[PDB]
Structures are given as C-alpha cells and as structure tokens.
Design a protein around this motif. Structure first.
Motif, PDB file in Angstrom:
ATOM      1  N   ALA A 408       3.840 -65.252  83.895  1.00 37.77           N
ATOM      2  CA  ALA A 408       4.900 -64.434  83.280  1.00 37.77           C
ATOM      3  C   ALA A 408       6.329 -64.876  83.668  1.00 37.77           C
ATOM      4  N   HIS A 409       6.510 -65.257  84.934  1.00 35.88           N
ATOM      5  CA  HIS A 409       7.802 -65.662  85.478  1.00 35.88           C
ATOM      6  C   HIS A 409       8.337 -66.943  84.855  1.00 35.88           C
ATOM      7  N   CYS A 410       7.477 -67.743  84.245  1.00 38.97           N
ATOM      8  CA  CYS A 410       7.914 -68.922  83.471  1.00 38.97           C
ATOM      9  C   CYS A 410       8.882 -68.609  82.339  1.00 38.97           C
ATOM     10  N   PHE A 411       8.921 -67.355  81.910  1.00 36.23           N
ATOM     11  CA  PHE A 411       9.623 -66.977  80.691  1.00 36.23           C
ATOM     12  C   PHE A 411      10.900 -66.193  80.936  1.00 36.23           C
ATOM     13  N   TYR A 412      11.457 -66.392  82.128  1.00 37.85           N
ATOM     14  CA  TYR A 412      12.700 -65.771  82.512  1.00 37.85           C
ATOM     15  C   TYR A 412      13.770 -66.382  81.613  1.00 37.85           C
ATOM     16  N   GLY A 413      14.428 -65.501  80.856  1.00 39.78           N
ATOM     17  CA  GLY A 413      15.495 -65.887  79.935  1.00 39.78           C
ATOM     18  C   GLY A 413      15.028 -66.917  78.940  1.00 39.78           C
ATOM     19  N   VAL A 414      13.909 -66.587  78.305  1.00 34.86           N
ATOM     20  CA  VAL A 414      13.332 -67.320  77.151  1.00 34.86           C
ATOM     21  C   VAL A 414      13.449 -66.240  76.091  1.00 34.86           C
ATOM     22  N   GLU A 415      14.241 -66.473  75.060  1.00 39.22           N
ATOM     23  CA  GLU A 415      14.581 -65.377  74.167  1.00 39.22           C
ATOM     24  C   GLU A 415      13.661 -65.324  72.968  1.00 39.22           C
ATOM     25  N   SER A 416      13.080 -66.457  72.584  1.00 39.89           N
ATOM     26  CA  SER A 416      12.010 -66.453  71.594  1.00 39.89           C
ATOM     27  C   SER A 416      10.880 -67.468  71.894  1.00 39.89           C
ATOM     28  N   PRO A 417       9.696 -67.239  71.299  1.00 41.08           N
ATOM     29  CA  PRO A 417       8.629 -68.220  71.382  1.00 41.08           C
ATOM     30  C   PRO A 417       9.034 -69.535  70.763  1.00 41.08           C
ATOM     31  N   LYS A 418       9.996 -69.485  69.852  1.00 41.39           N
ATOM     32  CA  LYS A 418      10.389 -70.668  69.107  1.00 41.39           C
ATOM     33  C   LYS A 418      11.079 -71.780  69.889  1.00 41.39           C
ATOM     34  N   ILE A 419      11.444 -71.573  71.153  1.00 42.89           N
ATOM     35  CA  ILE A 419      11.980 -72.689  71.968  1.00 42.89           C
ATOM     36  C   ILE A 419      10.884 -73.412  72.742  1.00 42.89           C
ATOM     37  N   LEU A 420       9.667 -72.875  72.654  1.00 42.35           N
ATOM     38  CA  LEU A 420       8.555 -73.357  73.457  1.00 42.35           C
ATOM     39  C   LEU A 420       7.735 -74.410  72.696  1.00 42.35           C
ATOM     40  N   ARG A 421       7.287 -75.424  73.441  1.00 45.63           N
ATOM     41  CA  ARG A 421       6.425 -76.465  72.926  1.00 45.63           C
ATOM     42  C   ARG A 421       5.285 -76.766  73.915  1.00 45.63           C
ATOM     43  N   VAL A 422       4.033 -76.578  73.483  1.00 44.74           N
ATOM     44  CA  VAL A 422       2.815 -76.804  74.320  1.00 44.74           C
ATOM     45  C   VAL A 422       2.209 -78.167  74.001  1.00 44.74           C
ATOM     46  N   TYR A 423       2.185 -79.090  74.969  1.00 42.89           N
ATOM     47  CA  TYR A 423       1.499 -80.386  74.796  1.00 42.89           C
ATOM     48  C   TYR A 423       0.165 -80.407  75.558  1.00 42.89           C
ATOM     49  N   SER A 424      -0.882 -80.846  74.860  1.00 36.32           N
ATOM     50  CA  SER A 424      -2.213 -80.968  75.440  1.00 36.32           C
ATOM     51  C   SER A 424      -2.538 -82.423  75.608  1.00 36.32           C
ATOM     52  N   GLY A 425      -3.503 -82.683  76.481  1.00 33.01           N
ATOM     53  CA  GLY A 425      -4.059 -84.004  76.692  1.00 33.01           C
ATOM     54  C   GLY A 425      -3.031 -84.991  77.168  1.00 33.01           C
ATOM     55  N   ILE A 426      -2.208 -84.583  78.126  1.00 35.48           N
ATOM     56  CA  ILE A 426      -1.096 -85.423  78.577  1.00 35.48           C
ATOM     57  C   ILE A 426      -1.299 -85.896  80.003  1.00 35.48           C
ATOM     58  N   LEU A 427      -1.305 -87.213  80.186  1.00 35.08           N
ATOM     59  CA  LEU A 427      -1.366 -87.789  81.518  1.00 35.08           C
ATOM     60  C   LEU A 427       0.048 -87.916  82.058  1.00 35.08           C
ATOM     61  N   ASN A 428       0.818 -88.790  81.409  1.00 39.82           N
ATOM     62  CA  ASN A 428       2.191 -89.099  81.801  1.00 39.82           C
ATOM     63  C   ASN A 428       3.087 -88.184  81.003  1.00 39.82           C
ATOM     64  N   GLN A 429       4.099 -87.601  81.633  1.00 43.87           N
ATOM     65  CA  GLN A 429       5.202 -86.960  80.886  1.00 43.87           C
ATOM     66  C   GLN A 429       5.944 -87.975  79.981  1.00 43.87           C
TER      67      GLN A 429
END
Ligand SMILES: *[C@@H]1O[C@H](CO)[C@@H](O[C@@H]2O[C@H](CO)[C@@H](O)[C@H](O)[C@H]2NC(C)=O)[C@H](O)[C@H]1NC(C)=O
Ligand SMILES: *[C@@H]1O[C@H](CO)[C@@H](O[C@@H]2O[C@H](CO)[C@@H](O)[C@H](O)[C@H]2NC(C)=O)[C@H](O)[C@H]1NC(C)=O
Ligand SMILES: *[C@@H]1O[C@H](CO)[C@@H](O)[C@H](O)[C@H]1NC(C)=O
Ligand SMILES: *[C@@H]1O[C@H](CO)[C@@H](O)[C@H](O)[C@H]1NC(C)=O
Ligand SMILES: *[C@@H]1O[C@H](CO)[C@@H](O)[C@H](O)[C@H]1NC(C)=O
Ligand SMILES: *[C@@H]1O[C@H](CO)[C@@H](O)[C@H](O)[C@H]1NC(C)=O
Ligand SMILES: [Cl-]
Ligand SMILES: [Cl-]
Ligand SMILES: [Cl-]
Ligand SMILES: [Cl-]
Ligand SMILES: [Cl-]
Ligand SMILES: [Cl-]
Ligand SMILES: [Cl-]
Ligand SMILES: [Cl-]
Ligand SMILES: [Cl-]
Ligand SMILES: [Cl-]
Lengths: 585, 585
Positions: A408-429
């Motif tokens: 939950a604390h990850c979302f401090y001052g995150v005003e919408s879901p629309k700024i978020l991006r979930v990447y799967s299957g990632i080794l290297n950033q």
C-alpha cells in the motif's frame, strides 16, 4: 470445448450414475470432476415432472464423446469441462433458497445467519453441505438451526423444496477454510478407523492426493509395493472417523499414513500427477494402442484423448517405435499396479487444469550464484511510475492473470492508476525500453484501514487493464493457505532490485524467517503484530517474500519496512487471505 | 471344480445381470455359457418369497472367483462349469409342469401333446421355448394350444405358475432339430434386416460362430478389416427377420454374410476358436500381464485363468521373454480389434469343453500313400470275436466314450456281448497280443426292425463296459447333423482291414459317394432306400464311411453290403440320428 448448457434437452442413454444436484450448473461440475463423465442431463423443478425426479443429475459417458439429443421440457444438458483449456473451479458460493438438501445430519446448532452457518460448515472437518432454518421458519424450535451434513459422495442423497430454509455447500474448495491441513506423512504406520473406499496407487503421494479430492476421506493408509501380503500392494485405503482424527498409530513396515489436504487444495497439486512410473504397468480398460517415440509423447496422446485417464508406454534395442496404451477405469485409477513388466506408466495431464496454475512444476534451471536469470522468479514484477521520469517504483507479485499483489505504501502521492506501468518477465531493468510492452493498471485497491507502513495493513492489489498470457517467464505464485498457518517455512527468499539506491540485474537472496517475538524484542516504538512477519540475516518495497514448501512457492510476505542487524518486516499475507479473495472474486 | 449346488444359500453382491430360469440347474447352464458369470443365486418357488422374485437367476462375477455365502431359504446357489474338465451340454430336455414361461408369442397352433409342441419349437427357426395348454386346461378355446416364443436372451422375460399348462425349451442344442443349416458363406455381400446386436470379430468364421450361439441371431454380416469406413472394420452385425431369411442380397466389397448354424451346433466348432491372429491386438479390460515364451503359452496362461476370455501376446531381437496380456470384456469379445501393432491375439480354450469333442482339430501327420499310420483314423475300432479263435469280426467307430457304432449283421449268431472284444488305437492287427488291453462290450442294441443287411436297418450300438480315455490314438467321430441332410460330401473315405480275406496294416481309401438312384440302377432285387447310401470307384462290415467337411469328420455311413464295378451300400447314419440319441441319452 462446449461450456454452455442446453435448454430443454436430454442426452439419450449413456448412464454411469445418478446424483442429486441443486442446479445443472453444479451438475456440470460434478460431471467434470467425476473420472468418466463426459456429458449429462439435469432435471429442473417443473410441473411437467414429478417431484422425485427433480434435481436429478445423470452422469453419462459415450465412446464417441456425445449422445443423441432429444427434446424434453425442464431437462438441462451439457458437457464436462474435461475437454477445455480454461481453468476449473469446483467452488459453488450459492445459497439455495427454499432448498432442503438431505444427508447424514451430524451437528445441529444455532446461528445468526446463513453466512455464519456456511462459515461453520466450511471450517468443519466433516461438512459437505448445510441447511439453515431462517428466522421466518414456522417451528420456533427449528428457527435459526444450522444443521451440517455429509454423504458418501459429497452430493445430497435427496433434494426437496421446503419454504423458509436455505441450503449450501462447503467453501473448503474456495480456499476459505480455517481448518488446519496436516501435511505430516507418517512412515511405517497404519491407521485402523473406518475404511470408506480403496484405490490402487503407485505411491503414497498419489494416495494422499486421491484422499484429498475424495469427499469422505479424512486420512489414509497406503500399503507399499514392498508390503508382505501380495493382495494389498499399492493399496490406498481411504479412511474416516467420528472424531476426524485416526483412533490409533499402529506401527508396521512398508505402510505409510497421512491426511487429506482438502483445506489447502488451492496451493497443492491434487489432480496433477506429472511423474512417470518405471518398470510399472497400470492395469485398466484399453482405449487404444498407438506407435509412440517416448513415454512423454505417450502421456500427450493420453492427455489429448479425453476418455484416457492413464497409460502405459512399453519402450522399444530394436527401433524407436514403442507402444502407447491408452487406458481407463471406473474410478480414474488402475485396477492393478504391476511392477517388473518393463512398462512406463502415468496419468492424463488433462487433469492439471483442475489444479491451481500456481502449483505447476518449476523448470529446472541453473540458479547460479546470487544473480537471477530468465524464468527463475517469474511471479516478480517491476512496478514503474511514469512521473517525474519513468523509473522503478515498487516490486510486485503476479497472483492472478489480472492481479498484482504489492505494498500500500508504494502508492504515496500516486493520484491515478494511469501513471503506473507493470512489467513482467524482466531480468535487467536495462531490458526495459520505450517500445517494450507492459500491463497498465486499472484500479488500486488499498486496504481501507491502511494508514502507515509501520502500522498494519500495508497491502495493495493492482487490477491490470489486460490479462497475462502465462509463460515460463510470467507465472503466478500461490497465496498461502489459511490451513497452513503453523507451517514452518525453511526455504524463504526475497527478490527485487534494491528499492534510495537501485540495481539493474534482478537480485535474489535466501533469507531466514524470524519469529514475531524475536523481531519484537529488536524493535520498539510501534507494535509488531500477528498480521506482520519478519526475516533477515535484498529487494524493494512491495516485493515478495517467496517461501518454497513441498515443491510449491508461497507468497508469505510483502516487503513493508526494512529499517536497516535489524530484520525486515513484511506484511503477513496469510492474514489477508479473506481480504484478497473478497476483493478478487 | 464345484458342480453341485448349495441348498439355502445366496452369494452376496457380485451382480452382472438377472434373468429368469425354470430351475437353478438351468441357471447354472446360463451362468456357464454367459461370458463373465462365475457364480450365481437362483430363487425357488416359496412361501418365504413373493411370486415376483421366483425364478430369478442372478449371474455374478468376483475378482477372487467367489463371494460371501449368507443363509436364505429357497435360494439355490452355485458355480459355473467354466472351471471344469468334464464336457458341457446346454441341452435341457425338461418339460416344466404348471409353468408359464413368458416371451414374445409369434405362432399359436394346435398340437396333440407337449412332446409334439416341443418337436415344433425345435424344428422352428425362431423358437427358444414353448408353452403347451394341456387338454385339462379350463378354457376350451385354449386347450391343446402350442404357443412358441422368443426373447432377446433365449431366457423367458417372466415365469409364473399357471395350473394345467406345460412349458419347455427348444432342443436345437440336443442335436434333435430337423432345421436345415445353411453353411454357404456369401463373399462381398451384406444383409439389411434387423440388427439385434454387434460384436467385434477378427474374421467372418468367428463372426458366424458368435451368431450361432447368440439366440436372437439368424444371420449376419461381417465388415472386414479392409472395409472403407474405419468405424466399422471387424464389425460383426448379428441380424434377424420375421421370415427368418434375409430380405435382400446387397452387393458390396470387403463385407461377408452368412447364417447361424444353431441346428448343426454338435458337429461344428462354435465356442472353440483355436487360431492366432497375427499383427492383431484385441482390446479389452486387463486381467494380468505375465512373462511368456510364446503366444501358445500365453493362450495357456489365459485358458488356465478362469476370468480370462482373450489375450494378446507381444513377442520379444532382444531375448525370449514376451508379455502375455490376459484380458476380458462384458461380452467375451474384444471392444476393438487393432491391426499393425505387432501383437499375437486369440481366445481362451477354456471354452472348447463346451464344444463336442468330435470337433477338435486333426493333428497334422504325413498321411502317406494308402497305408494308414498311428493317430490317422482314431475313431476306427477293430471288433474281435473270442469264438472259435480270437479273430477280427467287424469294423466300428467310436462315437462316444462308451459307445461304438457298427453294423447289426456283424452279430449273426453272437449269443452274448461277453464274446466280444473292442480294440482302439490299432494300426497293425499283429499289434494285438494276449496282454493287450481292450474294452469289453456290455450291451448289443440292434435296431428292433433289422432283419437282413439288404433290407433296411443294419445298425448296431456297442455299449462298452469301461469308458475310453480319449487320445491322439483314440477319439470320436461326429454324427452327421439332421440339418446337414443336403450337404454334398466330396472328401469321403473308408477304412478297415478288408472283411473271407483280411489284412494286417489298417487300410484307407478315398472313395466317391454315388447317388441313391445311380446306385439303384446298378442294383435290383431289393430296393435301395433313403435310409441307405452308396459309394465306390477297402474295409470291413460295420466300418465307417467317414466324410471330411469344413475341417470336421462325419460318420456318414456304416459298411453294410459290397456285392463286388458295383458300388458298396452303406447304412445312412443321418437317418438314424433320433434312434442313436434315443438309445444313448
Ligand atoms: C456442534 O457444533 C458446535 C460448533 O462446531 C459445537 O459447539 C461448541 O461446543 C464447544 C464445547 O462446549 C464450545 O466450546 C463452543 O463454544 C461451542 N460453540 C458454539 C457455537 O456453541 C458443539 O459442541 C457441537 N456439538 C455436537 C456434539 O453436536
Ligand atoms: C404357425 O405355425 C404352423 C406350423 O409351423 C403353421 O401351420 C402350417 O401352415 C401351412 C400353410 O398352410 C400348412 O401347410 C401346414 O400344414 C400348417 N401346419 C399345421 C400343423 O397346421 C402356421 O401356418 C403358422 N401360422 C402362423 C402364421 O401363425
Ligand atoms: C426438437 O426441438 C427443435 C426446436 O423446436 C425442433 O426443431 C425439432 O424438430 C425437435 N425434434 C426433433 C428434431 O426430433
Ligand atoms: C543485462 O544482464 C546481462 C546478464 O548478466 C549482463 O551480461 C548485461 O551486462 C546486463 N546489461 C548491461 C547493461 O550490461
Ligand atoms: C448359516 O447356516 C449354518 C447351518 O445351520 C449355520 O451353522 C451358520 O451359523 C449360519 N450362519 C452364519 C455362519 O452366519
Ligand atoms: C506292422 O506295421 C509296420 C508299419 O508299416 C510294419 O513295418 C510291420 O511289418 C508290421 N508288422 C509286421 C508283422 O511286419
Ligand atoms: Cl430444518
Ligand atoms: Cl512411497
Ligand atoms: Cl471403452
Ligand atoms: Cl483414441
Ligand atoms: Cl485421480
Ligand atoms: Cl396358454
Ligand atoms: Cl474373413
Ligand atoms: Cl477385472
Ligand atoms: Cl490371473
Ligand atoms: Cl465367444
């Protein structure tokens, strides 16, 4: 495959057996889970049928995989889900109004509501289904009575209309049960309580897996291959008792005893027996015999033949052209298990879709050093924040096709879901580029009682916008079962990218759990609680504490606050299982 | 094995099916002949049972070959005769008094007596059993009515008491039938009449053999391995018609059509399928899998396992240790016949005891020149007369364990059976010494209407004092079937020692039949009749005219009077079948 039912239709003739179900929709579940049923015919409540034939669920088989459809009013017909690629549930949350479902009544107590009477059935070792007399039930004596029932089959022996009463099933198969699962398997031990059924099993795991899905079985004794009396080798004795526990622990060699894990069903393999049994021949009825190159391909030929339940590949010396025997029986098991005739045997994988996808096997890889590699921790996601610049924000775990579990604390001052991006299957950033594909979040469900990380409740779900096509790279991790609350996990790991400072290659680290009071002594100011857990002696906010237990990975903790040796504090996922399920459906 | 019944005993639980029988003794026959039944329980007429449960015959199977015996009054239980070395009959001569056996009634005519009504049922293509209203039956309308019946099973659908009526079965299986057997098998031909059942058969002989013992089957169409539609390869379609004959002869390739030989049952293999089917796998339920050195030994392992009905030996390249699969199904047949998987398949020989011993195969031998050798004509006996000196008197044929068939004229001035000595298995007369063993005759049954050879009736039975232990040297020959009256025999032989002058080595001679009117034209003074037959273009008085037809030897004639080219005149054995059976039981 065909999932949808058939209004006013009866399949003529292929009867195996007849049971009673509240609806055709659950008739279909019964059919799916019964080892031979392919099609069926439910009989709905109707003037055109006498009351004795209502709620009849006729399970049927056909050599051709179908039957003649003739017209009948209030006959609902359908096919099993054996033929299907989509996952299979077994959990019927329905409360049936005015429906009295008959069975052996064994407890009869008072209850505030139908919901509470269901919770009671679910939390009970013996309960299959209940009937709850509502406050409007005429007899004052019987008003608010929650009577629990069981039958041989899990199915009621009769169904009758009875106004002002509500019936419903156990939700043990919805992962909602508080019942403890006893995973302890007892070598050189037999049990001597009520023998309710018996099957032939290649080993005790399969014996126990069969106990788990058999509704009358609470525990079992398996008599092994090396057992003295030949008539009882490979015999899996399915047992019960009035207590629920076994009366006595008789010692004896080559026998092996254990319990049903019905309450932990969603985190264990149960219908998925993926092993091969060498120099082993499974006896059953012969479906077909085909040329095959390997035992593995034989299993495929079985899996893809819907009537096939098990097989025996006899290997070719000579040339590469074995014989694959596709077989079946009345109960999904071999009628006899022979050793020493050189066969390679196993079961249909057509079953594993009945199992939770998070229980499927881990692909052998050379997990080297403490730098991860592709496919290794495939539940891990990297949560990116578009704002200010695109950057790693949190770790998360895939727990569903459309769901991320995180902090939950990850979302401090995150005003919408629309700024978020979930990447799967990632080794290297570094692998992440502008063209790279990602899942967009649609909704952030924060626990309504969350205030601060160091307080309780630091848990969040991301509902994704599109669902995940599961792969060796992208797969879910299992929630820990409410019944597994006293499991001592000893193979726990944290993963992530360091989150402050951050790293590129995904890092991994085996770390030890630490007890809640060994943690509390090393931290004061706010209270550590039952709803937290600790470990130490790294990863990001939101990331998984993943524990491997009995070949299955569990999401035991979410990284909440490190404060650093002082150990990391984690959200205790087990304590939020009702909540996760409540919010996810 | 256990042949004897069990008074007041019920076998608990192993039910296959339930039929109606007049008695437990015939229940046992039904059980013996049904492909799975091992044990049963008949329910006798009794105050302690309601009338609806009377005459119930519950056929049962058990994995262990037995069941729990619990006490019940008027329950008769027993075992099948599958387990037995003694021969098996199938012929129930009983007239059941006051017993009304229900089935589909199809002809209803008048008759002098129950005996005549049985003769009528027996001589009819469709009849399974009859009911005969005696002259004492109250309704004058129904008095003396002989109603014939049939059912799906050969068994009546119900049995009820009804005073002054007598019921009974067809004696087709007693070799008493005058019905013609159509042995003509029609290649590239199908029949399209009523399909009453279907089985999978490896070839058309087996298909026809199955038709013969199936009570509803009058004729059949077999769809061969090379038949275009894959779903119908090896399909044996068992058929019937109201006429009794097939409606039409539709041409079509790879199909093959024929008739039941129910009326000739006693001279044909029927239950004895001794061939092996190569590159053929019979699908069924798996009884066991054992190490075996050859297909022949596999068949033995099947034969000696009572539940086994058929098998597939998969040969070992490699070493000499194949796998023998013992199998079974619900109907004695494979559920599917696969070609091309390299198996060697066939059936249990545990059946051949149901066949007449005179139908068992002929042992390949190098029948050289026209001098016989050991085992060649093993039905032949030499009849010795002790008086004046021990000398060959007549030829004879073993037709039973205790019975010789021979000529009446052989016994001119033979004052007792006690001067007679029957030697079996004799090549050379020289082989006969004082120490040599022989069968003593106990009774000489001469046809009461016999006067002179050149008149009719030159036929005699010797009832032996001790029975013959059958061997490759000593075996019986089959009587010709009353239904085979128009068979054209083309492989006929006479055997004997010349009897006047005599020879030492047993002689043999293929000789041609000649028609009764081609014979009559070459002989006048006394009349040649239907009860005689001729041949010529040698042997003794009393000796056999043995004709080979469809792999089986038949005793067509007994040497009566040569008079010599003028042909030999023989007693026409076929015309004395009632008589032989009447006198022998
Ligand atoms: C029937 O079931 C209920 C609940 O599962 C049992 O009630 C509990 O009994 C114990 C023993 O006194 C108490 O500690 C609990 O508080 C009771 N719970 C409730 C809700 O009353 C009950 O004992 C069972 N009884 C039987 C044998 O039928
Ligand atoms: C019923 O069966 C009997 C005998 O099998 C049939 O009676 C014969 O009918 C034919 C035709 O006229 C005659 O030549 C025979 O002489 C009859 N025999 C006797 C004994 O009467 C009879 O036709 C059948 N009838 C049906 C169709 O039920
Ligand atoms: C069954 O119902 C359908 C829908 O009305 C109808 O078209 C059909 O003729 C009915 N019966 C059949 C095909 O036997
Ligand atoms: C990505 O990871 C691979 C695997 O170790 C590594 O060789 C590579 O250096 C990483 N990327 C960069 C930026 O080098
Ligand atoms: C069955 O009958 C026999 C004969 O009288 C008797 O000895 C026996 O005790 C009875 N019942 C059993 C053994 O259950
Ligand atoms: C008996 O038969 C055998 C077989 O041909 C023959 O060799 C022998 O000569 C015969 N006996 C006598 C008396 O020679
Ligand atoms: Cl109630
Ligand atoms: Cl084991
Ligand atoms: Cl099948
Ligand atoms: Cl198939
Ligand atoms: Cl299973
Ligand atoms: Cl009558
Ligand atoms: Cl053929
Ligand atoms: Cl079996
Ligand atoms: Cl066996
Ligand atoms: Cl058969």
């Amino acid at each position: 495959c065909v999932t949808q039912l058939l209004k006013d239709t009866c399949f003529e003739g292929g009867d195996i057996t007849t049971v009673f179900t509240p609806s055709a929709k659950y008739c279909q579940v019964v059919c799916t889970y019964h080892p031979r049923c392919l099609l069926f015919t439910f009989t709905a409540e109707s003037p055109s049928e006498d009351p004795t034939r209502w709620f009849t669920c006729v399970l049927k088989d056909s050599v051709t995989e179908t039957l003649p459809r003739v017209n009948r009013t209030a006959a609902i017909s359908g096919y099993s889900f054996k033929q299907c690629s989509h996952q299979i549930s077994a959990c019927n949350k329905d409360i049936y109004v005015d429906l009295d479902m008959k069975g052996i009544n064994y407890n009869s107590s008072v209850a505030k509501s139908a919901q509470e009477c269901q919770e009671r059935c679910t939390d009970d070792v013996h309960c299959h289904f209940f009937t709850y007399a509502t406050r409007q039930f005429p007899s004052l004596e019987h008003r608010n009575i929650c009577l629990l029932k069981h039958t041989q089959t899990g199915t009621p022996t009769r169904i009758t209309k009875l106004d002002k009463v509500v019936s419903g099933f156990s939700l043990k198969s919805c992962a909602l049960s508080n019942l403890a699962c006893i995973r302890d398997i007892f070598p050189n031990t037999v049990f001597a309580d009520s023998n309710i059924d018996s099957v032939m099993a290649p080993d005790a795991f399969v014996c126990g897996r069969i106990c788990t899905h058999h509704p009358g079985c609470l525990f079992f004794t398996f008599f092994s291959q090396e057992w003295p009396k030949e008539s009882q080798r490979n015999l899996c004795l399915l047992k019960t008792s009035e207590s629920g526990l076994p009366s006595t622990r008789i010692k004896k060699s080559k026998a092996l005893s254990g319990f049903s894990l019905q309450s932990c069903r969603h985190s264990i393999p149960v219908f998925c027996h993926s092993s091969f049994y060498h120099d082993t021949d499974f006896l059953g009825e012969e479906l077909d015999i085909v040329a095959a190159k390997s035992h593995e391909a034989c299993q495929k030929l079985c899996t893809n033949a819907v009537r096939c339940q098990f097989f025996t590949y006899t290997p070719a010396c000579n040339e590469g052209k074995g014989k694959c025997y596709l077989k079946l029986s009345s109960n999904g098991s071999p009628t006899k298990i022979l050793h020493g005739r050189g066969g390679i045997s196993g079961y249909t994988l057509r079953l594993c879709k009945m199992d939770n996808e998070c229980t499927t096997k881990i692909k052998p890889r050379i997990v080297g050093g403490t730098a991860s590699v592709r496919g290794e921790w495939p539940w891990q996601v990297t949560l990116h924040t578009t704002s200010p610049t695109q950057r790693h924000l949190c770790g998360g775990s895939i727990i569903g096709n459309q769901w991320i579990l995180t902090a939950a604390h990850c979302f401090y001052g995150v005003e919408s879901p629309k700024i978020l991006r979930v990447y799967s299957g990632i080794l290297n950033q570094s692998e992440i580029k502008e063209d790279t594909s990602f899942f967009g979040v649609q909704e952030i469900i924060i626990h309504d009682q969350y205030k601060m990380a160091e307080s309780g409740y630091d848990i969040a779900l991301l509902k994704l916008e599109t669902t995940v096509n599961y792969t060796d790279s992208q797969r879910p991790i299992c929630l820990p079962s409410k019944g597994d609350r006293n499991v001592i996990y000893t193979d726990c790991w944290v993963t992530g990218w360091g989150y402050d400072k951050i790293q590129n290659t995904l890092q991994k680290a085996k770390i030890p759990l630490v007890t809640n009071e060994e943690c509390q002594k090393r931290y004061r100011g706010h209270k550590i609680t039952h709803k937290m857990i600790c470990a130490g002696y790294k990863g990001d906010s939101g990331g998984p504490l993943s524990c491997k237990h009995n070949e299955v990975w569990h999401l035991v903790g979410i990284t909440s606050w490190g404060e650093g040796e002082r150990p990391g504090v984690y959200t205790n996922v087990v304590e939020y299982v009702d909540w996760i399920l409540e919010k996810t459906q």
